[PDB]
Amino acid sequence: MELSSLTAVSPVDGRYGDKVSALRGIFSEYGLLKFRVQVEVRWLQKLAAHAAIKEVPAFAADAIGYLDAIVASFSEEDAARIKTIERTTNHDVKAVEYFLKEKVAEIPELHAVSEFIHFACTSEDINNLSHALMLKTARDEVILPYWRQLIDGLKDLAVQYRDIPLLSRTAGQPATPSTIGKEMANVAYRMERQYRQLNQVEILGKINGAVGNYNAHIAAYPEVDWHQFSEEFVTSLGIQWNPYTTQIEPHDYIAELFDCVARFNTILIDFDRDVWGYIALNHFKQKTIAGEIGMPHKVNPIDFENSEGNLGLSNAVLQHLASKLPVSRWQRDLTDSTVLRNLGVGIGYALIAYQSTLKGVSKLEVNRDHLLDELDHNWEVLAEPIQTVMRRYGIEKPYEKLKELTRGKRVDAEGMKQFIDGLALPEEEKARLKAMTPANYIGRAITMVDELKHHH
Amino acid sequence: MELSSLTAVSPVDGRYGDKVSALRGIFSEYGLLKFRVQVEVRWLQKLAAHAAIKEVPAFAADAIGYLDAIVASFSEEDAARIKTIERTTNHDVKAVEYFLKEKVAEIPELHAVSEFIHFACTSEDINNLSHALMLKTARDEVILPYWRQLIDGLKDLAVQYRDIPLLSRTAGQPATPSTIGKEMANVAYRMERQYRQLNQVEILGKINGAVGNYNAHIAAYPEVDWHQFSEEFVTSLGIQWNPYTTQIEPHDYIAELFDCVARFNTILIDFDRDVWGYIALNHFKQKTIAGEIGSSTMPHKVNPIDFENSEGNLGLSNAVLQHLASKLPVSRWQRDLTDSTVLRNLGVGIGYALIAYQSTLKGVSKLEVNRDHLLDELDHNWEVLAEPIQTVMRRYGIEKPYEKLKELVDAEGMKQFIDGLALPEEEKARLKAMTPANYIGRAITMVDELKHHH
Amino acid sequence: MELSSLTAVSPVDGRYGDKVSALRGIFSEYGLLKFRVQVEVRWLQKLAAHAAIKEVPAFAADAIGYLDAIVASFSEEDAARIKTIERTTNHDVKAVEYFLKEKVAEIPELHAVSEFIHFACTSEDINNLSHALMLKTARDEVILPYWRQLIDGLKDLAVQYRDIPLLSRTAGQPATPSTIGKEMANVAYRMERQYRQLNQVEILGKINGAVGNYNAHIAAYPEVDWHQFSEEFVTSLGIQWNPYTTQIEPHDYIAELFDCVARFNTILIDFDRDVWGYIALNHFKQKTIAGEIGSSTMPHKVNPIDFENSEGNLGLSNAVLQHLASKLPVSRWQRDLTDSTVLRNLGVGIGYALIAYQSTLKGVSKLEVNRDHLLDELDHNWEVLAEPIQTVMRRYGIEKPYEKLKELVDAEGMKQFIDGLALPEEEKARLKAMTPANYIGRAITMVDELKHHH
Amino acid sequence: MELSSLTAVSPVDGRYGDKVSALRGIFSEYGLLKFRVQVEVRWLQKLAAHAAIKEVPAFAADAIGYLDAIVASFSEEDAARIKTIERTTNHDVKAVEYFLKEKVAEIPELHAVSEFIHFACTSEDINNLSHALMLKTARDEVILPYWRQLIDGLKDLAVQYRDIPLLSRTAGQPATPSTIGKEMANVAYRMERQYRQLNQVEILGKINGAVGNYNAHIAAYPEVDWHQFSEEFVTSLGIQWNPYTTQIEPHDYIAELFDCVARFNTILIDFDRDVWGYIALNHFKQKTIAGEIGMPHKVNPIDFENSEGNLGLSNAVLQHLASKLPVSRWQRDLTDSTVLRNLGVGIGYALIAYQSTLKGVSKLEVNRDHLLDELDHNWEVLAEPIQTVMRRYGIEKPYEKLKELTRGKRVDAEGMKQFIDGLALPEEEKARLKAMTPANYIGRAITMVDELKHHH
């Protein structure tokens, strides 16, 4: 069978292919080839523009334009030609070199310096810079924007539900109340920490030959400062320089990048699960779309579930790459090549999940009635504030007395109030206690939500 | 950009797409829909054949033939129709139900009972049996044949190199000799153990309604023994019955299946690495093809790229296989839907493995043992004869053997030492007759006896 | 600070030390040394009993008894002596060899053949058989008994709660009813499958010299059939023979063993989480002990801490078990020594599991089903009867059943709907007679039939 | 059997117990209890010193000293008493509270405010700050110092072996040369990047009650700014403040801390493996200790192997904690409690490995003779520089000609020189080529080593 979204083995290009189309121009074989061509062309241009390298004279405006067009217009047909050349070479980067030599053969000025294409380079000089550009593009244009949407989404929920009381659950059991909004705010804050971290991760690149010592460069041009040339080239591409490497860029920064993405994904899994649970408890209802089919009565939180499942898959891939890539035998073994063709896979599962969560979030409808009704059936949670007040005014064995009263026992409002009336506390504090309810015993939850904007 | 092999995000459908084409008819959404159709059709057929279910009379030969053609000829076009319907329902199994109702509308016999399509079934009754069929098909038609190729490949190398001596390396250091063949035989034996295990793994399936108690079935047909009906149906599909489940089949067998595949893959990683090293030591050279380029900048290179490709994909395969094995069997209460999207990846872990198996086989086809180097290295490591000398000395009670050797080298040297030993000439001769190259123990016979085990 | 339960870095030897004391005589360094001694002793005993090995005459009854006592009475003191010797050799197995030579020096019969202790053996010949004995002992005496306790525990809960109805939750939402007992039976069935599997896992052992070819053995005793000698020895220890290995036993069976334990643990995590949730929903209350404190600040709390402790340790157990399973079977060439230190952790993964099993059993002992809540919740979810109504309507050809229900609730309501259906009174009555509480399908009978399967 | 290093189930407290003794006073149950007592005492002292909280008057010098002594002298006997109290409570932090109330009963000024011990606190307020102090102590006093030793060790090797030629291996095959020192330098640089990152990881702490909203605090003292009180307290302990949490500190920073440790461990695994290989190739010999026993002839790199094995174990634990800890049901489930008792386990395996590598490094003895001899048998590596020079001076099909000459062929010095003599290149460049050898074709390797000090 020919490949189509229906026949694709992986759902990243299959069922959810439409959800990750942006990655097709980045992490696919076409994307890799597109970036490699960009790097190869920029290298030749630097050689030409470098005065000390006279064998490659400065290019005329038309030649530079022709080279820039090769880069800018790089097409699927172009990639197919490279793939056809690779049939012969069984070496993908050599095929890219030959492809560029073909494209250039018709331009005298360019054909004349044809043998300077890939001059002194090792395949990894091209590959690592391509990987850097792929990751930087994905982070800056795709990953961070979804993260910002998720953060803003969570913040909107926090504000929207800032004062809606919630019977908290610790160890799964009814506990000291909070607000739906505060619970959303905690998540936004954690996501923001990771956002900052991902944005600060260094994206490294190198260019130094076969094993990292500019051997071939120096052999031919011993008068050129290749170490400086390298730093200038990598930085000219918008990549940070990694001066010490073997044949490969060591990949530590990819682990750094993927580790932070996995941490964010982990926070999201925690979120997907919590919301699934709030929905299970009927604290939220879900909007329904006419014609759709959810047992004819059910409305399932499938969006959060789809996200949760894909986040687990995403992390499985990202962490394998993070832990396996930085280990390469001696000056390098080639096991990382095929693995690096999966940079987009881990990211793809994540993107699918981000969109699913956003879709699920858009359907949320808070059930204030149930939230309040549940709270009203759990007056035992007032045992904490009562005992804490007792401790303040020196009443003996406060925690112990409240434990005897509520642990494993059902106590309604009248029973809790009956207990308060029997305490030897100042009249004022006595009334203050009888005035609280599980619904209003929310501490600083609301102000906490309102102050979120002052952080980060 | 539109999806194509060149633009595919995953290399399983991209660069290596042509290496896993068989999986496109199994684990893809087309494959899932195809098997779902098979299951729905067989379910209706069983209802018809069941005499106690009079509302679905037995089907005549032509109608059965029409239903069988729906199953056997299921096309991408049919799959596309289901996807079109799903755009309305936002429910894939329900779309399959509607697709079938549409397909049988022209046959009055079938159209008359179209409402019994999916009767009393919950979506997972259809999904789990589809996953079982997908995994069974993959195992019997795809995975096991590659494993047999690898095993036979290794056995061929064992036989071919049965008597080629090798300076063994323990802790990476020169050690007691073996033969290339024996080292290959060790791998084939391990692969065979896993082969037998994968073949013995149970592939489970269930059918019992919404939460596993046949509630709906019993409500409409309380006189029918649905528990028996369930067992017969699952077994009729060639799947083993799992009588106790919630809404979902628990997935324990998927972990069992994936665990054995991962163990085999680990054995293969060990092989890819060891051979990579034998090539590094120049114990093996590799066949080359004119026109091919070993390296872009070092023209003299011939790299073991096939083994490295294999090794890399095996690590990836295991990472995915392991995640599915550990995550799938945990589902909240009577089930949460996180396993649905995850099960669309059953073929991903398998795909990386298939790619690796083909790469290893390609690497194996290029190996050219280098006897000259193997023998020359052995001839410069006579120190390995310290072991047999020490053991013989011990047999005859010579004091401090381990010490006299550990303390105290070429042939002449080792020859001088032996001569000065208090041993009978016959034994001295036997020791003076051995060389690193022939101090291979039972290596050759071990290879010849391999065929006698599994 | 000196090591004690309070200062131990790992909680397996620290806080939970008393929960895994049986493992201290198995997987610890004392345990490893103990088994190494057993193996070395049995090896010497076999040499003696072998008629072709005349340099080691058959041992008389008292000497055999002295050797057996060395094995059976091995103490921490003996272990300490070995460690003292190891300070000189920086080689643990060699220290064991010296320890034994010291121990038999007083018996002339044994002292006369002390040089044959460890004859022709490589350290791993001793280590692998020790690991096999350690794992077999752990499986048969420790792991399987806890698994039987869990399984029987779950079966007891299934029987005890066989007819207690439950509002099932799929995707966390109210769904077709089941019974608490049936949900427990599902778990016991899954645990049983893994129990049978762990019991069937092969525990392999080998003995064949430096690199697996009996080089040293054949050099000294070329007339002895060491391949036969090897098989007899390993099987005499109650271990299954692995005829093809390098210096090390490949460790594939350890992965097989750990994979089944991890699958069982995963089933248990699923159980710990589900029960945690049933307690959260108040379907179960928990027994309390006077004096105990549920929470430091919320006096009303009764937390499912036993299940949570279990769940946490199971995740840890699997992480370690999985690392050993995937890492141990890969060893450079004829072996690298990275597996040595790693195998000192065989008991770590197992220890976390044991702690978890005990915590779950403790949690189970405190459960008190809350029928009142379970029934009250069911009585507020009549919408679940939409399923059976729809299926009956379908049986009798009423058009658009799924639609009339999906589109269109308490008892009276559901009762009004049914009354307006074109069905025979007999069927209307059957539908009007069901309630969420009794719409449990075959749940009860499924529980009663469990005993009939495995 | 009683617990001893011989009977311990885990080798962290068993065979290698002596290698991690520093962790016994930090991550063990004693350490956890020691830190909890510290936090509890500091909290009571802040309450007393806070003017607005009159029910807890400023403490006299002797009272403060008595409290400080409880903290400073905390002993194993003290921990045992807590463990004995825990027999009753089946709640470890409540036992700590009761323990402190007992210690204080004999001091009137302190006994008088006994019920303010643990005032308004939830167990996690004590636990998370204890975890923060444990990790900060381990990082600053134990982890970073071993990392510095490893970095300095690698740098010493780089300088020591700066000009020793090495036949590089890419894909395991002979390639463009480098120097032993340069290969060591690459590793030091990578380790330094992680060192910087670990040192910059935030160690977070919080204190805000049952579910994170100061409910109990505000119930008793609505006039006190508890949000400010919280920030002051956490910072007073030398911990960075985390203002938004549920009952638990979310643990994202632990994942951040462990992710960087795992990356460092991964670089070390790569190092242990590479050295194992250099030793296999006889590029290094190993020093031997009289009396020790290594087949009587062998000397095995057991130190690097022991390290490699423990690094894998370390990462297995660290990453499980990193990925599992930040996911907690609703306002928290208690599965993290038992897991956090293993913070020292992952670190312990790492420490064992660091010491093993250092031990192995101390035994290294470079084999210059073999390194040079091997290089002299691989003149084919000069194909790269020859073709690159040919490309410079416009000689047609340079790479192709060298490929025909060397790929899959054995070419000695005379053969390579014979080829150079036949090239149409300027006399000067012709001699330059005939002057190079595999041993001197090391590019910028030496200067690269010498310039390492200018980075970081």
Ligand SMILES: O=C(O)C[C@H](Nc1ncnc2c1ncn2[C@@H]1O[C@H](COP(=O)(O)O)[C@@H](O)[C@H]1O)C(=O)O
């Ligand atoms: O400048 C060079 O090329 C230097 C060279 N090392 C290599 N570096 C990068 N790529 C290389 C290398 N070698 C091969 N190849 C080619 O990489 C392609 C790999 O295929 P895949 O496993 O499918 O990802 C596939 O096309 C391989 O042929 C060396 O000899 O060290």
Ligand SMILES: O=C(O)C[C@H](Nc1ncnc2c1ncn2[C@@H]1O[C@H](COP(=O)(O)O)[C@@H](O)[C@H]1O)C(=O)O
């Ligand atoms: O038998 C039933 O359908 C009842 C049902 N539960 C379900 N079981 C199985 N599939 C279901 C279920 N619910 C939805 N869906 C549909 O599954 C699809 C999930 O899509 P994806 O996340 O992309 O894998 C997507 O098409 C979903 O609509 C329940 O509510 O208990």
Ligand SMILES: O=C(O)C[C@H](Nc1ncnc2c1ncn2[C@@H]1O[C@H](COP(=O)(O)O)[C@@H](O)[C@H]1O)C(=O)O
């Ligand atoms: O049969 C032999 O001993 C020969 C041998 N290989 C070895 N096989 C097994 N153990 C060996 C080996 N070598 C050392 N050792 C000793 O193992 C111990 C390793 O200590 P640890 O890393 O703490 O687990 C530690 O005590 C080590 O000294 C070889 O060189 O091929």
Ligand SMILES: O=C(O)C[C@H](Nc1ncnc2c1ncn2[C@@H]1O[C@H](COP(=O)(O)O)[C@@H](O)[C@H]1O)C(=O)O
């Ligand atoms: O302020 C509180 O205590 C509040 C409370 N939550 C808890 N937070 C922290 N620890 C708690 C909690 N609950 C129990 N425990 C006790 O923790 C101890 C856990 O044991 P282990 O599994 O061995 O690590 C063990 O001693 C447990 O009893 C809540 O109800 O949410």
